[PDB]
Design a protein around this ligand. Structure first.
Ligand SMILES: [Zn+2]
Ligand SMILES: [Zn+2]
Ligand SMILES: [Zn+2]
Ligand SMILES: [Zn+2]
Ligand SMILES: [Zn+2]
Ligand SMILES: [Zn+2]
Lengths: 221, 221, 221, 221, 221, 221
């Protein structure tokens, strides 16, 4: 139990405020295809849903003796190790939010009549639009809105391409539990940063495979 | 024998109470296909069966000089090293239970008439249902039961999708024997955590390949 | 916050002057193909465009404890780690320029009537032509010009092959964000040197796959 | 020669009693197919035969400076390093027996009329049957026997599936010679534990590919 | 700048005399195929040509902290790290010659009428023929000559096979630039030894794929 | 030159007597196929021939700082590092013999009328037959002979399978030159032990692919 108290101290000394969302598989699936519902309000079409968030403190690291002090985030994009205490057993797929850290992302879409009507889901917890434009130039604020993490564009932008740069909250999902037998005892987790899991809606939809942008993207895979 | 006494001390100093189940290949196999019987009470269709459990003490580690102090659980999901003493030779496929550690899991199923009748096998040693729902909302306790590690749902949930989150006992199966010539002498084992071996019954059955959920799962493979 | 002040000092002690360009996906894409416009002035056909540059100071390294002091540039051609402070969140795809460092490159093209008319895009920030020739010998200065980072040749060089050696500004694009939770706080970036991303226009165009030079190139891939 | 005397001391200090069998390729091969004879008494159908055993002392390790003190048995299932002195040159394929170490194994077979008549070869040096059963339950001792390392079942078990758990002598075969120029001088060998080479006879024979059990086996490959 | 002066001292302390040839892509390419001209005097058919050599001093290493003191030449045949000072920016594909080091090579060819007439290009900077023969025995000096790094054989050797062993100057080509931002400032280069890039002309030509010798070659690939 | 004198001392201190054979590609090749002549006396059908042997002293190691003190022979079967001094440049494919070290090997063949007549080439420098037999038992000495490293069997063994165990001289061939610029200066070589290159003649010949023995061989590949 001397190793436990050291770990609790580490969490307290180096931990940052996070939110924890308990995950489950969303039961909206289409029995015929196995696919989530496109516009499911629980999972937004991704097939994993979450229970209400709860606060905790979590130390996040990318290097430790267990990795030979190598940076696991360099070895594998978007990987980190989290250590936390919580009243409940943390599970695979659960999601952690670091409210005070804003991360960037860029995305681009062909705006059809459906996208005008239903809006374009962004999937992230969008906090700011840092840039937005079409081929015609800057999209002014009166011509769009962000609601329920969806981009709603003015109908004049039908059949245009919209490009977007955002700030969103830093989030991770649990890929694994570590040291499951060692040791509110500490729980140690392998984390995956959200931007390495989330796939933007496709550039253009086919009624047949959807069309992705034909652009060399240097973002690490 | 000085290396032996050090190892016995380690087991005693750092070992936790576990149960050991001697494994054998289940003889329920269908001679025509080589597949276990779906609802075999010995192996539950997985083709490996176990003799009655026996208690011991086992030190469990994910790092040692033999791994360069690298975390083998990070290198390979669900891998650990166990060290124990026992009157009998421990073998590949044998199963260890850590009664005092509860692990999580999530699973999802399309509930057909067969599943109502026979129940849905969960495979784990289920200790608690932390969440259960269909597309219609929460499944109340009077509408289900867990018996012999199977989910029995009320017949009104036929043709629904049920999603489930559980707590189960931590268990490992032996993938290998290590240091077989060195050294109740210590036995050293490569372990595989259960959740990395167990495959849930498929989302939906075809009368043809079964249909799995079309969901990106971040659980480490 | 003691780790933060050390990092700020490192940037200040070892940082060099750089320019930062905020990147976004260029909305010139052809809705039918997903390809950028060949001669788009924003992205030059590469599908990523940039906002006006801003100055900062960035420490650039190829070795650190996080890599076991291994040279990541040897492990992976054109990879480096950058550390900088900036008022805005740096993102994937953003581009850094090191104005005071000139890098080399060589390229070769079959000069058709289109290339005479529109010029040949070089993609780099070209600062000098160190060598230029055809099969007929040296191309004298009155017979070419570099405008908007394009090679414009005199029309007599139609149906010739031109070879070119240049100096260009050293530039990187961001492939990843590192230590996203640690810590104008320092921002730590995985960088990709430009010459490992940029693809020269093809040797010869087909009206069908374009024809690349059939030459064994020792440049690291 | 100072490195030699150190090595001889190591063998003497840390060596255990082993038997050595000189191996050769068995000349029972069918000229038409290149396959050994199924029931060859020399090689039992495996195509390698052995001369009479001779005693020696061999130090067996899974970690050394030559492996960076990494456990080669974890890196590669069933691998070890042996060091011994012997009057003859030890070769690839030769087999070492550690009489005082018993190892486990499990196997399963469909019992046809041939298997009743000829018995089922187990391939290992079987010392004990720890468990034996069919779908009908425990096979009592009067209903079987182990002779010449074959399982002979009572004819009533025709068309049954028999499952078996055993103890056998620990054995290795030489995969390589190491330090062939350094240095009865010490001989250093890369060893392969028997259970990682031996393939049990197939579950069921086809008159066409034989049918193996359709069971997920966690034994390391 | 204290790291710079250390690097300059290393070059001076451990550097050897080398020649540097600035490389460019040869514009002899056939527009139809993308292949260099077989007997181009600039590139000899390899598609890379060089400007006149210039002398410098270069430290050459196969081990450094950046490789964990591992021998990169063992990790990857023909790889080394060069450090040098020069008035011009050294580029990918440029070639370094170490005049005072002679390296070996062996090659073999079927001598057709073309090869008698045009000679057989050897590609290396040939300094000596250490052995030369056909199936008929030793080729005496009056029956051959080396001119412009080509083997010219007496016409009596038409339809013979000639085998050749040579000494040539040690040469490298630049595969990469390292530490491009650090720091006549030092330039640090990843080098590729010539014999790992140069491909001998084929054993026999087909008018269809050319025929290479069907011989197991232990030269590292 | 202080690093040179240390290396010369190492060779002298730790070197063993070896023979060196200068290698060249054998010009017996069939112009039509590119294959050596089956019974060429120079290369025995392997396509590499050797000039008369010369004595030297060579230090042979499987571990050095350049390998992180890892055993390259474990990393890659039959690999070693040799260091020697010689008046001539040692080359790829050249062969080293360690006369005072005898190595083992086993081989097996179907004896047709050709093999009786021409003998079976063993390829190694055979020093002793430790075991020889057919399906009929031991082959007595009056019924065979080893001449020019070929097995000549009495004609009564036509249409038999012969199995053979031998002792042969330890030999290596050069796969690479290391430290080509550093530094009778020392020459440092990557070596490949002969038994990892030599392929025995096939079990049985087809007039179509030859038939190899269908036996699981544990010799490291
Ligand atoms: Zn849903
Ligand atoms: Zn069963
Ligand atoms: Zn554009
Ligand atoms: Zn046999
Ligand atoms: Zn040319
Ligand atoms: Zn020959």
């Amino acid at each position: 139990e001397f190793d436990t108290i050291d770990m609790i101290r580490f969490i307290n000394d180096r931990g940052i405020k996070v939110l924890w969302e308990e995950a489950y598989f969303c039961p909206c699936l289409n029995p015929d295809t196995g696919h989530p519902r496109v516009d499911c309000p629980r999972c937004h079409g991704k097939g994993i849903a979450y229970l209400p968030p709860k606060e905790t403190i979590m130390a996040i690291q990318s290097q430790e003796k267990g990795t030979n002090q190598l940076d696991i985030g360099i070895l594998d994009t978007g990987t980190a190790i989290g250590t936390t205490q919580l009243e409940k057993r943390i599970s695979y797929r659960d999601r952690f939010t670091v409210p005070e850290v804003l991360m960037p992302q860029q995305m681009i879409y062909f705006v059809n009549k459906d996208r005008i009507k239903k809006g374009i889901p962004l999937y992230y917890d969008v906090k700011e639009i840092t840039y937005i434009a079409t081929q015609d130039g800057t999209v002014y604020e009166e011509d769009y809105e962000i609601k329920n993490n969806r981009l709603y564009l003015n109908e004049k932008y039908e059949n245009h391409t919209v490009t977007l740069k955002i700030l969103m909250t830093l989030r991770y999902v649990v890929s694994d539990i570590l040291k499951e037998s060692r040791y509110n005892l500490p729980q140690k987790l392998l984390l995956k940063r959200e931007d390495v899991i989330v796939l933007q809606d496709p550039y253009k939809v086919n009624d047949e495979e959807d069309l992705e942008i034909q652009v060399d993207d240097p973002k690490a895979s």
